Amino acid sequence: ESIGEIMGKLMQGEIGDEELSKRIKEIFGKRLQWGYKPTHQQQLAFNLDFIKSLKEMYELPSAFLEAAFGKTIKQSGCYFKDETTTIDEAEEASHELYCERAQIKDGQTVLDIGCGQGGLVLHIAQKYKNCHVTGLTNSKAQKNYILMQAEKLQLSNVDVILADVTKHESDKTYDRILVIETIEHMKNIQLFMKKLSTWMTEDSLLFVDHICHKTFSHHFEAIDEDDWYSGFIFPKGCVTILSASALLYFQDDVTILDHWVVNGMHMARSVDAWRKKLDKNMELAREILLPGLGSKEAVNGVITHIRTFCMGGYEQFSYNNGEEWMVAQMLFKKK
Amino acid sequence: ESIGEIMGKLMQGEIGDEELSKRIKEIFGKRLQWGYKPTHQQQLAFNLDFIKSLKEMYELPSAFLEAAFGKTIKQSGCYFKDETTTIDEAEEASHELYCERAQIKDGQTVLDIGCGQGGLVLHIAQKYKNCHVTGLTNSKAQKNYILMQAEKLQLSNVDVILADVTKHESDKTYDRILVIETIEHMKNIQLFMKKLSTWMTEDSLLFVDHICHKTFSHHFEAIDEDDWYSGFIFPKGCVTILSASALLYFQDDVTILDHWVVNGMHMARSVDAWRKKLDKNMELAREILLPGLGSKEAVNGVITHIRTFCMGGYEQFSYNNGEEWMVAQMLFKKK
Numbered sequence: 001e002s003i004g005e006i007m008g009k010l011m012q013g014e015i016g017d018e019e020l021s022k023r024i025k026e027i028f029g030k031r032l033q034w035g036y037k038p039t040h041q042q043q044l045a046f047n048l049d050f051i052k053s054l055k056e057m058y059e060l061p062s063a064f065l066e067a068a069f070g071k072t073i074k075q076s077g078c079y080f081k082d083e084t085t086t087i088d089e090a091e092e093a094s095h096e097l098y099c100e101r102a103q104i105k106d107g108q109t110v111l112d113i114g115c116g117q118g119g120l121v122l123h124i125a126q127k128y129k130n131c132h133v134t135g136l137t138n139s140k141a142q143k144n145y146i147l148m149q150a151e152k153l154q155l156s157n158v159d160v161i162l163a164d165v166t167k168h169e170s171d172k173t174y175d176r177i178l179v180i181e182t183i184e185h186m187k188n189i190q191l192f193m194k195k196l197s198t199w200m201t202e203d204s205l206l207f208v209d210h211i212c213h214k215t216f217s218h219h220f221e222a223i224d225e226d227d228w229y230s231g232f233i234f235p236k237g238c239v240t241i242l243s244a245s246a247l248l249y250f251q252d253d254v255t256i257l258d259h260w261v262v263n264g265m266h267m268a269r270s271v272d273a274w275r276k277k278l279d280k281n282m283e284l285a286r287e288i289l290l291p292g293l294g295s296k297e298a299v300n301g302v303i304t305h306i307r308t309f310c311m312g313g314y315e316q317f318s319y320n321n322g323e324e325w326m327v328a329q330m331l332f333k334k335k
Numbered sequence: 336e337s338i339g340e341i342m343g344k345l346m347q348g349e350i351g352d353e354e355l356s357k358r359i360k361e362i363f364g365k366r367l368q369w370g371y372k373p374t375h376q377q378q379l380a381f382n383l384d385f386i387k388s389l390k391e392m393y394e395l396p397s398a399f400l401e402a403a404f405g406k407t408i409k410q411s412g413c414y415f416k417d418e419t420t421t422i423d424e425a426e427e428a429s430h431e432l433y434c435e436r437a438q439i440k441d442g443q444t445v446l447d448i449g450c451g452q453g454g455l456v457l458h459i460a461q462k463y464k465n466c467h468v469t470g471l472t473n474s475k476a477q478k479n480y481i482l483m484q485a486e487k488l489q490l491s492n493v494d495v496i497l498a499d500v501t502k503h504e505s506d507k508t509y510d511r512i513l514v515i516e517t518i519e520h521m522k523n524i525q526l527f528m529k530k531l532s533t534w535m536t537e538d539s540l541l542f543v544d545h546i547c548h549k550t551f552s553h554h555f556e557a558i559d560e561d562d563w564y565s566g567f568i569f570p571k572g573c574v575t576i577l578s579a580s581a582l583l584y585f586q587d588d589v590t591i592l593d594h595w596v597v598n599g600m601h602m603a604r605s606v607d608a609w610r611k612k613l614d615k616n617m618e619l620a621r622e623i624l625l626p627g628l629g630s631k632e633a634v635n636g637v638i639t640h641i642r643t644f645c646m647g648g649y650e651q652f653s654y655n656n657g658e659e660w661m662v663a664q665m666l667f668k669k670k
């Protein structure tokens with residue numbers, strides 16, 4: 001059975017959830033076989049080879065995003081205390097977790113790199129009125145969304161830089177730099193960390209959160225021709241999953257102070273909530289998308305892609321009860 | 336059964352090898368239970384707590400050493416290609432491995448910190464005639480042994496600094512600094528690495544080899560009152576076993592370039608060879624030691640201590656076919 005055939009059934013909604021989950025789980029299982037080595041000697045050889053290789057290197061309407069994601073449209077792993085924690089609660093708990101671990105205090109200048117729909121920017125600005133909070137995003141629609149939300153919430157301490165972070169040049173420095181699940185998109189990590197350090201003083205802290213595997217790194221791409229999923233979700237070679245310790249090898253310009261991981265069931269519950277909410281709001285979602293997409297068929301395609309991303313994310317992050325893929329967090333100061 | 340009673344039988348040679356091995360293996364088994372956590376989240380919490388805590392912190396005659404150790408009296412893990420590799424061959428292979436991984440080239444200035452009986456110093460000096468090689472040791476007997484060996488081998492490119500490395504002050508810099516199983520004795524690691532960096536230029540490399548556990552760190556000390564072994568071998572709290580990745584968190588002043596581990600069976604074969612050679616030369620050893628120790632009883636005590644160290648080391652490093660305790664190696668440049 002070919003890719004084309006599976007992709008055919010998928011688009012027609014002819015693959016039931018149980019089969020879909022089973023297929024994607026199998027794909028991730030093969031990644032685990034690829035990544036785990038027989039000895040720690042071989043594991044480190046494989047991991048260092050990956051790290052060395054690194055060193056040589058239409059937007060959805062906001063009404064749709066609001067129908068699929070939680071209240072602040074957080075697009076990153078959330079934190080669920082209880083089985084009954086709602087996605088809105090989990091967003092807030094995640095925001096609070098970042099503020100604790102990044103040691104945010106009232107009065108600081110704060111920069112949020114790849115701020116998305118600005119949930120974290122708005123959270124910090126509201127909770128700490130004397131902080132000035134800057135979000136940086138490459139999306140004009142995101143910038144406009146954040147500035148509108150700041151206005152509605154009577155926040156006067158928010159600004160947004162519209163920039164490709166890899167191209168952004170400034171001599172401005174910040175007390176705190178936050179990077180929440182943005183580094184996975186960075187083509188040049190050593191260069192990224194170097195640039196961040198130039199936006200820091202000796203008093204600054206840098207907090208990074210990234211999806212990881214606990215043991216090994218990999219690009220998010222097909223191992224083989226049986227893998228229809230990876231290239232469906234990310235049709236570009238644009239996402240890297242670092243191991244939980246990979247960034248320890250990128251301390252040319254910054255120095256680690258603390259390091260944590262959050263078990264993958266938190267991420268799994270996040271994507272599950274998004275999937276369920278999208279399913280609940282399916283009719284509304286299709287109506288919102290139709291104008292901008294042009295046909296019900298193109299609508300179905302965008303919906304299939306997002307829903308499959310959630311179904312696949314579930315299998316990835318829940319694997320072995322959250323103990324394979326998870327979220328890594330690190331705190332650094334400038335050299 | 337009390338410590339005193341086991342220590343009593345041990346000293347009298349009333350514990351056979353099989354029972355001795357079994358007892359020590361059990362002790363290490365309990366350390367593994369202590370060190371492995373149920374989730375990577377908890378593992379990292381435990382490991383970072385250890386790293387944070389670190390940041391707040393009569394000699395045997397040479398004739399005896401020659402009867403127990405290999406030809407160059409290497410007192411560190413060796414490297415065995417074959418099951419029939421002799422300890423002398425394994426010493427040389429280990430020396431060569433260090434030269435490759437530390438990128439030693441003819442003409443460099445080289446410093447070997449805690450050089451022991453100087454096997455590595457002599458190896459480099461002989462193989463690279465244009466290198467100047469300095470060993471640093473806190474032992475007058477070691478210094479004298481190395482200088483005598485250099486004279487006999489017609490080596491003109493060797494010097495030895497007699498110093499406590501933690502107290503040594505100098506503005507001299509070196510192209511290469513080697514630290515072979517010395518860091519385990521360092522009370523202040525952040526301070527040690529800082530000092531080393533002041534002896535480096537922008538062109539220098541630092542190579543560190545240390546016994547490790549692949550997953551977690553621990554001091555070499557008793558967990559409980561059932562552990563008669565740890566405090567017998569090291570009656571002081573003077574030895575730390577870092578995890579294979581612990582030094583990645585000590586990059587304030589140096590930056591990692593490469594990282595390896597050597598499976599623990601190499602160390603196990605090393606201590607096995609020492610134990611067997613001592614056993615072979617037992618009568619001679621007792622004769623050599625008697626003058627300086629004063630009684631056959633004090634002789635037996637020193638021999639029991641060394642032999643047990645080997646028997647225990649065997650169980651530690653061979654555990655799970657070398658995949659628990661092993662040797663970590665790292666290459667750094669100066670910030």
Ligand SMILES: C[S@@+](CC[C@H](N)C(=O)[O-])C[C@H]1O[C@@H](n2cnc3c(N)ncnc32)[C@H](O)[C@@H]1O
Nearest residue numbers: 074075076114115116138164165180181182185
């Ligand atoms: C996984 S989302 C995380 C968004 C936000 N941090 C959150 O937690 O909801 C990563 C974000 O990085 C942004 N991004 C990716 N590459 C970027 C670049 N080169 N410059 C700026 N932003 C970028 C994307 O547009 C996206 O909003």
Ligand SMILES: C[S@@+](CC[C@H](N)C(=O)[O-])C[C@H]1O[C@@H](n2cnc3c(N)ncnc32)[C@H](O)[C@@H]1O
Nearest residue numbers: 409410411449450451473499500515516517520
């Ligand atoms: C495990 S032995 C390794 C010896 C040698 N590198 C080898 O591979 O055979 C560690 C050595 O470090 C030395 N040492 C320990 N603490 C020291 C200190 N503060 N200053 C200098 N040498 C020290 C000990 O005397 C011992 O020779």
Ligand SMILES: COc1ccc(C[C@@H]2c3cc(O)c(OC)cc3CCN2C)cc1O
Nearest residue numbers: 075076077181182184185211239267271313
């Ligand atoms: C960090 O990896 C990723 C980075 C970006 C994306 C796309 C981004 C995104 C990122 C997430 O991490 C995520 O929750 C997992 C959900 C979403 C929703 C779609 N939005 C545009 C997906 C990823 O899987």
Ligand SMILES: COc1ccc(C[C@@H]2c3cc(O)c(OC)cc3CCN2C)cc1O
Nearest residue numbers: 410411412516517519520546574602606648
């Ligand atoms: C690195 O831990 C240690 C450091 C120093 C010692 C003492 C030192 C030594 C160190 C070794 O690593 C070793 O081979 C394992 C053998 C020997 C022989 C005795 N000599 C004086 C023992 C250790 O176990």
